Design a protein around this ligand. Structure first.
Ligand SMILES: CC(=O)Nc1ccc(CC(N)=O)cc1
Lengths: 412, 412
């Protein structure tokens, strides 16, 4: 048998806002968080824009001294996690601290720290590398720092499955609780790869939209004029909680996490297969996990990266999985507004999926001016759509052909 | 309901050899794999030695063309994965490809590659960044590339939990099989952190031994003259397999994986607590998971990094878990010979723990000339000790206070 898992707290930094309600307000308004990147020389770069976190104040969370030790991705991870725990009302005690764990991940980790320490290294040699370089840059330090700050002694780990990280982190945290290895988990991911290395790295693979003239129109999933993904920064964290543990302390329950699917394409290092066979297997695995029929799905938060191959594969995968119901569900890419937070994409999009359930509204796919060949599904073009949503899927399909799907259902 | 998990295949690059048998021969012979580093000028560094992989031929596994796109840690991860799969005798088919997954982790991932591309960016501009920078450097691409080469469509993910990565990777892969998410998993980790930022970063933290004039004597777990860990490179991979699946195909079974434990210290970003309270919680979780009397434990492969605080914390944790039986079991650190492979430490040491079971021998702790205050257990000083081993435990502890324990026993 298996215990049920609910969402009792959510936290976020995104290009739309410094918390969940501000981000969600921008999502439902169709607002873009995309703009040229500042305080950075991007002259020799073919992409000069992205989703930055605007006006983040780390000292709401940490002392200036402890923040100086930590890469921005870790700072963002901690901000979302601290928000999620506060949002949950959970009280950590000697009686429960061994049952409360953390799985906060990242796709690329501490590129900003690596960049700045490389500067020191090359210019002045190794003795100028920060003593906190390693612990302040490695991906497990959101889980590490959070556990130390709150006294969490439950399972303590971090995933790194590129653009699938956040989805896998939440799913595997849910499994921890279901199989009785924990009663509470903080899970999600964080990312800050709007360094030269991130824009240069993805830029070198010509993976990025180069629509520098109109950065807010760059991310246009399933639009015939799309030219690659938009790089974005931020974090999402959820408090996952066993249902009876949640009910006993009178927690506010946003939604139930009913399904987790994983698969590998085993196809290509960066490109999905044309027919989305891997994403189809993963969605089917998630629905089977949830004991649900494809007909019961109302809302999908797509991966929807605005890459020509990625977008088309996801249409193929949804038609294959959902057959005569594929047009009845609504599917949207919130990456049309946020851009692609890579390892954090799955975390913030799980939150948007839970909020679609709370508010009975499908977030828009903005910039869908001219759907491409075969993009004839309900993709919620331009504006939010109020509707019945009992069951919401969130998909993540990343490099190495690693796929994740989460199934959320209304709780009452 | 929970299925049993056996080891059918193992693979390894270590400072002692280019496979498991050659590495194991070194272990039983008390040979050091530590030598001054030759692959770069370390004259400006306070540490100029480590455990390098010697004579690695990537063209035993991959085309030179593919290898040139991949960081050494991915090459090392693929080499150990391919060895483990071949050693398993398992044949991938349309019938089973969806039931075979991979969880190969790293602490740091492609630091060398990211450093080299940082150098190109700074000296020459962003147009010199490799288009293979991201897929050739990020941690999930051991899992990704292995799945692509072998056609593995099961759960596809990667852990990054610093020096606990290998242990966590193996443990959670076992859980995937135990719970029915997969019948086979390739699990372990790989590390190549021996670049400027790696030796420089650990150097800046004053974490590394500085015994440059006698590198083979540098790693001296529990010795009163120890002065930090020795940085080492390589990979460990194991094929984990549901027991009936293994029996059904006539697989050679090395041992059964009966116990996995995790805990957080919630103590310090980098320092283990002196009393080993988190290590003790972790081992107790693992032993309860295995349904064992602690007195059943015959052999512990310690974390045994050769840091003052780490080594002593482990004696304290073992004494607290095992009481008087702490004086009956054998505990050794193979890090005395291999050094600290960081994210791969848990992977190679799980293999040494299985081979301890197959051959009925406790590997030595070499260089244990003067055991420190309170280091009065059977630490297998100097020479391999043939003895009865029914149950073997492998411990890892990492930055973020992250703890993993694996419990193996003989299978009949
Ligand atoms: C394996 C390979 O073809 N590497 C590669 C590295 C760097 C670049 C960027 C450049 N213009 O030189 C392009 C390609």
């Amino acid at each position: 048998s298996r215990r049920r898992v609910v969402i009792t707290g959510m936290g976020m930094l995104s290009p739309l806002g410094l918390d969940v309600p501000s981000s969600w307000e921008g999502i439902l308004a169709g607002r873009s968080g995309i703009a040229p990147i500042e305080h950075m020389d991007l002259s020799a770069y073919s992409t000069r824009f992205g989703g930055s976190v605007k006006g983040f104040n780390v000292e709401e969370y940490l002392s200036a001294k402890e923040a100086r030790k930590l890469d921005l991705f870790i700072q963002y991870g901690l901000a979302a996690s601290f928000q999620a725990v506060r949002d949950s009302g959970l009280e950590v005690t000697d009686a429960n601290r061994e049952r409360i764990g953390v799985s906060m991940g990242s796709g690329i980790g501490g590129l900003t720290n690596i960049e700045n320490n490389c500067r020191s290294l090359f210019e002045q040699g190794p003795r100028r590398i920060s003593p906190f370089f390693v612990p302040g840059s490695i991906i497990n330090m959101v889980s590490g720092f959070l556990s130390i700050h709150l006294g969490l002694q439950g399972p303590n780990y971090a995933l790194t499955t590129a653009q699938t990280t956040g989805t896998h982190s939440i799913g595997m945290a849910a499994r921890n609780i279901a199989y009785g290895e924990a009663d509470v988990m903080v899970a999600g991911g964080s990312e800050m790869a709007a360094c030269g290395l991130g824009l240069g790295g993805f830029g070198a693979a010509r993976a990025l939209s180069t629509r520098n003239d109109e950065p807010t129109r760059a991310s246009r999933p399933w639009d015939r004029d799309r030219d690659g993904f938009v790089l974005s920064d931020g974090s999402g964290a959820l408090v996952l909680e066993e249902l009876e543990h949640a009910r006993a302390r009178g927690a506010r329950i946003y939604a139930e996490l009913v399904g987790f699917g994983m698969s590998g394409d085993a196809f290509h290092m960066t490109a999905p297969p044309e027919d989305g066979a891997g994403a189809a297997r993963c969605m089917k695995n998630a629905l089977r996990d949830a004991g649900l029929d494809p007909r019961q799905v109302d809302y999908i938060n797509a991966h929807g990266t605005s890459t020509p191959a990625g977008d088309i594969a996801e249409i193929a995968a949804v038609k294959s999985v959902f057959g005569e119901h594929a047009h009845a569900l609504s599917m949207s890419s919130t990456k049309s507004m946020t851009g692609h937070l890579l390892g954090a994409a799955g975390a913030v999009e799980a939150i948007f999926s839970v909020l679609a359930l709370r508010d009975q509204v499908a977030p828009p796919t903005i910039n869908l001016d001219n759907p491409d060949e075969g993009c004839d599904l309900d993709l919620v073009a331009h504006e939010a759509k109020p509707r019945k949503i009992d069951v919401a899927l969130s998909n993540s399909f990343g490099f190495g052909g690693t796929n994740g799907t989460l199934v959320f259902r209304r709780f009452a």
